[PDB]
Amino acid sequence: PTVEYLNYETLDDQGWDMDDDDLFEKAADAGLDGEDYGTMEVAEGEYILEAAEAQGYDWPFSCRAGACANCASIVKEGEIDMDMQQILSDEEVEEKDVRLTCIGSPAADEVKIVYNAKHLDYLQNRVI
């Protein structure tokens, strides 16, 4: 039950690559904020945003029922289990690797994922 969360905003701000500089690995040498990069440990049956929230990590959330994408993320690798529902578009689960962190649990041992997907330029336009 090991995972590595990464700040999607840090990837853009720094202007790094998605998997070229191996942020999940080079990040440990940057000592960035723990709320941006770190190894998230979650057992089977435990919600990510929940296991990380008990450590000090922060995640975007609004519906908290797996019916919206505010808590959207970007799994860079591994696999996560979802509930009986699918509000996101497979394109986001395959082209953006987005998942539900409020109601999503890791089904693999090691998994990579970026937290705070709301930073995506596709949503930033929602700003009023």
Q: Which of 38, 66 has the CB closer to ligand FES?
A: 66
Q: Which of 28, 63 has the CB closer to ligand FES?
A: 63
Q: Which of 27, 74 has the CB closer to ligand FES?
A: 74
Q: Counting beta carbons within 10 angstroms of the beta carbon of residue 123, is it exposed (0 to 12), middle (13 to 18) or buried (19 or more)?
A: middle
Which 1-60 positions form the footprint of ligand FES (CB under 6 A)?
A: none
Minimal CA–CA distance to 56: which of 115, 113, 1? 115
102 is in an annotated binding site: yes
99 is in an annotated binding site: no
Outline where 22-76 has alpha helix (H): 27-30, 48-53
Query: What is the rounded end-to-end Cα distance, in angstroms, of the chain?
Result: 39
Which pair of structure tokens corresponds to residue 18? 């998605």
DSSP characters over 68-119: SSTT--EEEES-EE--S---S-HHIIIII----SSS-EE-SSEEEEEE-GGG
30 is in an annotated binding site: no
Sole binder of ligand FES in the list 1, 14, 64, 123 (CB under 6 A): 64
Q: Does 71 bind ligand FES (CB under 6 A)?
A: yes
5 is in an annotated binding site: no
Residues that bind ligand FES (CB under 6 A): 61-64, 66-68, 70-71, 100, 102
Annotated binding site for [2Fe-2S] cluster: 63, 68, 71, 102
Annotated binding site: 63, 68, 71, 102
